[PDB]
Every structure is written in C-alpha cells, then in structure tokens.
Amino acid sequence: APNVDSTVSLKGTDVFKADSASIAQNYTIPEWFKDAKFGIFIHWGVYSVPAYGSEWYSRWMYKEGHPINKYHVQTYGPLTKFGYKDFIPMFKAENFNADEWLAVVKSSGAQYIVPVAEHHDGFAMYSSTFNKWNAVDMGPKRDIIGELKEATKKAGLRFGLSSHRCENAWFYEYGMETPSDVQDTTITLYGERLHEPEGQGMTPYCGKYEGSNERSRRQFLMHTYELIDKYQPELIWFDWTVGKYPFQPTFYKFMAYYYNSALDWNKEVVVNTKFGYGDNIQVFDIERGKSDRIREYPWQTDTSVGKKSWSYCVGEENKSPDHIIDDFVDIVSKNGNLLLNIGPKADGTITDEQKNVLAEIGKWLKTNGEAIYGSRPWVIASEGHYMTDNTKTEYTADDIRFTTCDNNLYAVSLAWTDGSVTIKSLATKYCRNVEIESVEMLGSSEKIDYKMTDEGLVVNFPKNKPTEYAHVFKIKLKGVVVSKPLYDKVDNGCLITVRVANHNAEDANVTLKSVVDGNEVSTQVAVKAKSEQWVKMQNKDVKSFDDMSCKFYFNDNLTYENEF
Ligand SMILES: [K+]
Numbered sequence: 001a002p003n004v005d006s007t008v009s010l011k012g013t014d015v016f017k018a019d020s021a022s023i024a025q026n027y028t029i030p031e032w033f034k035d036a037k038f039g040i041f042i043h044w045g046v047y048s049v050p051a052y053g054s055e056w057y058s059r060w061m062y063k064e065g066h067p068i069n070k071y072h073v074q075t076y077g078p079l080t081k082f083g084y085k086d087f088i089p090m091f092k093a094e095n096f097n098a099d100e101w102l103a104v105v106k107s108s109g110a111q112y113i114v115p116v117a118e119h120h121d122g123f124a125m126y127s128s129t130f131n132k133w134n135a136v137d138m139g140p141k142r143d144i145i146g147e148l149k150e151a152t153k154k155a156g157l158r159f160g161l162s163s164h165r166c167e168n169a170w171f172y173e174y175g176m177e178t179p180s181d182v183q184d185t186t187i188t189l190y191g192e193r194l195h196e197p198e199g200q201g202m203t204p205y206c207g208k209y210e211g212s213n214e215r216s217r218r219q220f221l222m223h224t225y226e227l228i229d230k231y232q233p234e235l236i237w238f239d240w241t242v243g244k245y246p247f248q249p250t251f252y253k254f255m256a257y258y259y260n261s262a263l264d265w266n267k268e269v270v271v272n273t274k275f276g277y278g279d280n281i282q283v284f285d286i287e288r289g290k291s292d293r294i295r296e297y298p299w300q301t302d303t304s305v306g307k308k309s310w311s312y313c314v315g316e317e318n319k320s321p322d323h324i325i326d327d328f329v330d331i332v333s334k335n336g337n338l339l340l341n342i343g344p345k346a347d348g349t350i351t352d353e354q355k356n357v358l359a360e361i362g363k364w365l366k367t368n369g370e371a372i373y374g375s376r377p378w379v380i381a382s383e384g385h386y387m388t389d390n391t392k393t394e395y396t397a398d399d400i401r402f403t404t405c406d407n408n409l410y411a412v413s414l415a416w417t418d419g420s421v422t423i424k425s426l427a428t429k430y431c432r433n434v435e436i437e438s439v440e441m442l443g444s445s446e447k448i449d450y451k452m453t454d455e456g457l458v459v460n461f462p463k464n465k466p467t468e469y470a471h472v473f474k475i476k477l478k479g480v481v482v483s484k485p486l487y488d489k490v491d492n493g494c495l496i497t498v499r500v501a502n503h504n505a506e507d508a509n510v511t512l513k514s515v516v517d518g519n520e521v522s523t524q525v526a527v528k529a530k531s532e533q534w535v536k537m538q539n540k541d542v543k544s545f546d547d548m549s550c551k552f553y554f555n556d557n558l559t560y561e562n563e564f
Contacts, residue, residue, distance in 0.1 A: 002229050004221040007256035010229065011264040016256040018249070023281040027259055030268035032158065033235070033283060034298050035374040036111035037332050038365075039160065040358070041302060041341035042101070043116055043310040046123050046139065048346040049087040050075070053306075053313025058084045058121040062175035062182055083181035084121060084172075085189050088133070093140035096348025098151035104342075104350050105157065108358035109365030111373075112158040114237055114339060117145050117227055120167040122189040127230065130222045133189040140348075149231050160235030160270070165223050166242045169216040170194040170209075192216045197244050202275040210246040217250040224254045228261050235270040237285060237339075243276020255281070272300055285339070288331065293486065294377040294499070295335045296534065303327070304341040305354050312343040318353045321360035325469040326395055326414045328361075332372055333381040333401040333412075364467050367443035371410035371472045375403035379483040379499040379532065383424050384414075397421050397461070397471075407503055407530040409475040410442075416465060423457040426481065429559045432510075434479030434503075442472040478504050480527065482554045485514070493540040494548065500535055502527040513553035517542055 001010075008014040015026050047055045052068065054060070060068035062079060069079075076082040105113050118124045124134035126145035135144050145161060152159040168191035175182020175190060182190045192215060198207020212220075227233060236258065242251050255271060262269040271277075272285040279297035288301050304310045305324070307317045328338045340361075342354045365372060384399035397417035402425070403410045411423055426434060439450045439459060443466030451458045459473055481501045488495040494516060502508045507529050514521045516539035523537055542548050552560040 002225045004218065004225055004253075007253055007260060009257065009260040009264050011261075013260045013263050015263060016259045018252040018256040020252065020278060020281060023252070023255055023259065024278060027281055028268075029280070029283055029298050030270065032268065033270050033337065034376070036158070037337050037372050037375070038108075038110045038328070039112040039114055039235075039337065039339045040105045040108060040110045041114045041116075041162070041304075041310075041339050042344065043119075043304075043341055044144075044344050044348075045116055045119050045125060045311070046084070046087050046091050046121055047119065048312050048344065049090050051313050051346060053309030053311060053316070055119055055121070055311055059171050059174065062172060062178060062180050064174075064178040079175070079178065079180035079182075083175075085133070085181065085187065088123065088139050091139035091346060093142070093144070093346070093348040095345075096140060096142075096144070096147075098144075098147035099154070101148065101344075101350065102151040102155040102157070104355055104358055106155050107355075107362045108340075109362040109369060110157070110340070110358075112160050112235060113148065113152055114160040114162050114235065115145060115148050117161040117163055117231075118223065119164045120171040120239070122165070122168045122171070122191055124223075126227065128223070128226055130219065130226075131188070145227075145231055149233075158234045159231070160237065161227065161231065161233045162237035162239070163224065163227070164239040166212065166216075166220060166247065167239060168192075169212045170196045197241060199244070202240060202243075204243050204245045204248070204276050206244045206246060211241050211244050212247050212250075217247065220247075220250055221253060225257060228258055232261070232265055232267070233269070234267060235272065237272040238274075240274040243273055248276060251277075283337075288327075288334075288336070292382055293334065294381045298335060298337070300337045300339050301331055302339045302341060304343070305357050306341075306343055310341050310343055312345050312351070316343075316351070316353075318357055321357050321364070322469045324357065325361060325364055329372075329401045329412050329414065329470055330382070332375065333377060333403055335377050364469055367467050368412075368470070368472045370405070370442060371403050371412060371474070375405040375410065376532070377499075378402035378404045378409060379481055379501045380425055404501065404532065407476075409477060409503070411459075411473040411475060413461075413471045413473070416471060417461050420458050420460040422453070422455055423459065424455065425483075426452070426457045428454045429557050430482050430484075430554065432480040432508075432555050434477055434481060437476040437478065439476075440474050441466060442474055443467060448473070480504065480508050480510060482510075482512070482559060485550075485552045485560050487545075487550065489545040490538065493538055493542045494545060496521075496537045496539065496552070498535045498537075498552075499532060500525065500527050501532045502529060505529050511553075511555055512537065514539055515551040515553070516548050 060066045061072040127143045128134040172190040195209040197211030271282040285300040395414035397413040399414045446462035449460040483499040486497040550562040
C-alpha cells in the first residue's frame, strides 16, 4: 500500500528526503546510463487516431479558429458532439504487439526504451487506479505499459517511460472559452482547465498563472507513485513544466520516493528534466545547441525520425539514417545520449520506413559499436568545418568526432574520402611523447596506412567501405594529449578549461601555463595512467575579456595564442 503522504519506500527505506540537498548527498547518476548512449522514444496515444501529427491536437482543437479546430469540426464534428474523449473508442490498437515493438527497438542497437506512459491529453497508457481514463479500461483495453515492460525484460533491454501529465492541469484551457464538452467540468480527462503558466521557454517563473493546483499536484504524486510501484521503471522522463517554481516541492517528493524505491530494487535509476533541477541530481534533457564543447555532466537529447512529426501522421517524410547517425556520433562525443523517437500508427504498427531507419542504425552499430557503448569523451569532441543562400554545407571526412574507451582513441569521420584525413588534434603542440601503436578501421580487414606528422596523424582511407554513414578509426597510442583551451568570462578575469588524456601505462606529471595580459597561472597536475581529467584555471586582473592577449603552454610548448 503506497502513500503519497510519505516519501519512504514500500520497504521502509528513507535515505532520501524531498529536498535538493538530501538528493545530492546520496544520489549519483548511474554508469549504465553513461554506458548506454542510445534509447528509443515512442510517441503513441489517442493523438495517433486523427493522425494529424501533433500531440497538441487536444489543446488546439478547442481554440476557436485554429487550423486544428477548423480541421476537427469539419472532419469529426462540433466540439459539443465530438470532443477529444470521443477518439478514445476508435483507439483500438488492433495490431499492437509488445514483442514486435521490442524487436524493432532491439534491432536498432538501442539499450533502453521510453514509451509514453501519459501525455498532456490526460489518458493513462497504463493500469491506473485513480485515473479512469486509461488504456486498460478504454481504447486498447490492455495495459500497454505493462506489456512493454514484460517484452523489454525478455528482450534484455532496460525499461523507461515518460510522463507529460503535469501539463494536463492547463492543456484544455481553451475548451472553457468556446462551447465544448470541456465545459462539463465533471469529465476528469480534461484536467484542471487552468491558464497555461507564463514564462518564456525553459524558465521556472510562471507569472500570474501557476500552471498547477492542489488537486493536480496530488494527482501527480498518485500518478508517479503508481508508475514506480507497478512498473519499477529504470528511467522516468518528464516534460518541461515540472520545473515551474510552484511545482518543485511536489517534484522533490516524487524524486525522493523514486530514489528510495530504487535502493530496494537494487537498481540505479535516472530522472530526466528539461530545467529547474541540479545537473547532479538528475540527467538534463536538452537541445544540443551550437556549442562544440564537451559537457561536464551527462545529458540526453531527443529527436524524431519523422521530419514533420513525432506521433504518426500520413505523408510523413522520415530522416535518413545518415542524418541520424552523424548527429548521434556528435552527441556521444560531447557526453550526451540520444533518445530517438518513432511514431507508430494508431492501430499499433510501426511503419516500414521507421523500422528500416532503426535497422540501418543497428547495422551501423553492429560494426562500429565498440566506439560508442561504454565510451567517454576524449580531450576534445571534434575537428573540421544567416547565409541568405542555400549553402548545401555537408559533413566531409575532415569532420571528425572523438570518443575513448579502455584507453583506445576512436576518431569517427562523418563521411567517406578516397584520400586521407589529418587528425589535427594530434599535432605536435598538443602532445608529449605521443607514439601511435596501431590504427585500424572498425569492420575493415585492410591494413591502414598512416603517418604521424607535426600537423597531426595522417590516416589514409582503405579501398572498401565497411559501412555507410560514418567511419571509425580505432587508434592505440601512448603519450599525453591536451585539448585546445576554452575561455569563459568570470569578472575581472577569465576561466580556462582544458582536458588532458594520459594514454601512457605510467602516471604522468603535466604542467599547464596560462598567460593572460601578462598574468601567469601555472598548474602541476598528476594524471593517472590511462585516464583523463578536466583542468580548470583562472587568470585574474583581465581588464577586457574581448581584448585580452592569451598564450597557453603545455610542458613549455605553445599550444594556443589569440594573436589572430
Ligand atoms: K555521414
């Protein structure tokens, strides 16, 4: 018997209390998530029935004049005869098969699966007790989440799920401003019918509208406790409004109960949020942005295989496997995981086109997975590379992404060349006693011709492509390598961030020197054998960040200077 008035687990474990300091004291992001790299998101629900391509159909159909409202009144009927609830009898899922879904997910090389347990629209995809608008009692008349959990265990993968229910508090607000079934306030599917919280984007401020109330906060705990107690997910992903200030005390109660319960399961778990919580007590799920930097904290990022939509819509144009694999490699090199979405038809079938994209990804990982699974960032993630034209810029073989695992260096070219590439990150100035022991291309039987030069490691491509899309050189080397330095302003000075890899079998002592506007900062760092570390330095008394002179030395070699 679970109790939303207590964060203590069913077995009596109370290590975690519902506050940030408690969580940070006892929780650590698990190694399985960092090792896994790749999961599949599955946006499937009542919104798949109209097949419009939008999980926000339920919101906009009640906005008089909106394209979706106009579509819905013509296609299905007036909002008073045909509300969102009235799609539910059509959501029969006659061809849903949990084992077939998992066979697709497994075929992709993905290591965890994230079905939607409940979106903003109020319909539980699982066996809910308090929410009578659920898939066991209605629609498919089966426990979709339960069947996926059992299928995932037999498939040998890890089971996660997502909750978007927090937004149900306000999602249907427009139904109260035009004649509609939402105005029957006894229909609990349509939530609290509040105004959407204010705030531009990923911000905890909510303005005049909290976006939740006492009852929806209570139902959120009943909802998450249900999922925790019935399905023991290893990962729970949340949509953005759980970080609004009025919701945070409630969210911390859930986190404490989840992390306490996980201790009893002897399983380490992950929470994803988009903002509001520290990067050490959960795993940020964020857009990639334009930065080429490795992130210090593990993170996740999501994209759909569909170019137009996440949930199914007719006339979907799917992305190419080349597109997804190149982005996947970029993400993994910068310490991220990819959560890739597919959108099955309302009847439960994953489209042939989306099956084919996942299978091609899995074929690529069959040959190249050594560079991906269990890897960590190297010292630097990449090299290579408003226009008012179509510039048709694409990746070439000079666009390289790096990972490391078991002291091996993997250099992934994001396109083919019949010639050679030069790994510029291994140029003389970045290196101390680097000696290349061997170079191979993953999946190729051809001996790779390479030459270490002062400009970097020249690698000649073999004559036969082992796979399409991206091409992995596995490099065994000894020596110490340092990254290009990164600069950030921090009041009257600048922070300097550098990563150092010691590929030697012996510990190495390494001197880094930053000279900014004459001010010299040195650090002596002991880097253990076959290990990497971040190194942070700060120069003081920098009058202008945009105008400073910068010189950076690695064991008395000039590695960087901004003379331009
Ligand atoms: K490519």
